């Protein structure tokens, strides 16, 4: 029974799309202290650094056999290694959260990283935001020092996907 290699492999292509940026769920086979072996099943057990799998507390919230959704980078960098990274998954989830929060008009905490001529740059879950300088506060707050490094809640006004910037301000209240 010569069930065609073409048909059999075509079904796998139905189940596998070798394209960078595509999100595929993979199973961790082994967990090392510095690397995590995720066998998503493309060319090798991808050794994603364990630092990515640490939360804000530095703990591994994953176990042996856990499935995690990872974004595709490539197939082999000269040594046959499939490159995968949990950080890009973080990025995807953060973008989805921001996109839904704009529809929800919800407020998210963020830390003002710096200031520019047109306003300020904030950090929201690792994503850069612009806060209009004229819209930082209702009162003419001369004290620009206190508004640095503190977690303040902002609402997404204009979410920009082409420049990877999010327009935020102290709305709602």
């Amino acid at each position: 029974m010569t069930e065609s290699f073409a048909q059999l492999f075509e079904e796998s292509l139905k189940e596998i799309e070798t394209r960078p940026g595509s999100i595929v769920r993979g199973v961790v086979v082994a967990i090392d202290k510095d690397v995590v072996l995720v066998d998503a099943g493309l060319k090798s057990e991808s050794a994603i650094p364990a630092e990515q799998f640490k939360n804000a507390q530095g703990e591994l919230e994953i176990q042996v056999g856990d499935e995690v959704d990872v974004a595709l980078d490539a197939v082999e960098d000269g040594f046959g290694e499939t490159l995968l990274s949990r950080e890009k998954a973080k990025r995807h989830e953060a973008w989805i959260t921001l996109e839904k929060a704009y529809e929800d008009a919800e407020t998210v905490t963020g830390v003002i990283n710096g200031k520019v001529k047109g306003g300020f740059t904030v950090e929201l879950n690792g994503i850069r935001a612009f806060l209009p300088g004229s819209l930082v506060d209702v009162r003419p707050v001369r004290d620009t020092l206190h508004l640095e490094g503190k977690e303040l809640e902002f609402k997404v006004i204009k979410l920009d996907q082409k420049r990877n910037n999010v327009v935020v301000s102290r709305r709602a209240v």
């Binding site: 492999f9 099943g41 493309l42 090798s44 082999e76 290694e81």
Partner: protein, 224 residues
């Protein structure tokens, strides 16, 4: 092994188009997404023939050297080779393991001397620090030569993972007439290999598939 069995493990993937050896054209089904797809229709029958020849070799008291030094598959190769009363190399292949077998014999003699000494005694005739130093030397030698420490003579066949990764061993084998069965990915050169098994050589699951088939056939030949 089954065509479905290999396809499930993903044997069919290969390296990129830009990194390939033209001599592997017959075994390449084609390309998709700028990545080569190996022909498993070539893989399965050749693997069975390799199993048959390895069965004959193992049935005539043949010595089989499992060789693969990829960091991904070294542990699997060690365990699989030990499971079948055979020999392995799981760390960096030393250039001249076969052609400089005389010097490797000197190293094996050193290993036997060290462990015989460390169990008979004379460490009580040595400063505790000298004892620890000689123990460290023994440990390093054991790591280096543990898989071949009891091989005794020239091996009767080589099984190789990633022919390109282990080309040095393939070169010594070619010079010494030792038959080489090798997992040869699309990017590697199959000329030096007597029995080329065309398939993925990275994925630990596929490596384990090949090795499990090899070990089963070897045990069949051994039991008699």
């Amino acid at each position: 092994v089954s065509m479905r069995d290999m396809l499930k493990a993903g044997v069919h993937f290969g390296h990129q188009t830009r990194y390939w050896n033209p001599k592997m054209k017959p075994f390449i089904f084609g390309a998709r997404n700028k990545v080569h797809i190996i022909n498993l229709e070539k893989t399965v029958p050749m693997f069975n023939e390799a199993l048959a020849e390895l069965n004959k070799i193992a049935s005539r008291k043949g010595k089989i050297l499992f060789v693969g030094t990829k960091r991904a598959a070294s542990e699997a190769v060690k365990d699989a080779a030990l499971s079948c009363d055979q020999f392995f190399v799981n760390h960096r292949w030393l250039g001249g393991m076969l052609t400089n077998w005389k010097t490797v014999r000197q190293s094996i003699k050193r290993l036997k001397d060290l462990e015989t000494q460390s169990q008979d005694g004379t460490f009580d005739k040595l400063t505790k620090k000298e004892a620890l130093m000689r123990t460290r030397e023994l440990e390093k030698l054991e790591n280096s030569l543990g898989g071949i420490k009891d091989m005794g003579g020239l091996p009767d066949a080589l099984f190789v993972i990633d022919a390109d990764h282990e080309h040095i061993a393939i070169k010594e084998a070619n010079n010494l007439g030792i038959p080489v069965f090798a997992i040869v990915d699309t990017n590697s050169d199959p000329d030096g290999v007597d029995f080329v098994i065309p398939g993925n050589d990275d994925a630990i699951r596929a490596v384990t598939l090949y090795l499990g088939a090899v070990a089963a056939t070897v045990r069949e030949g051994r039991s008699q």
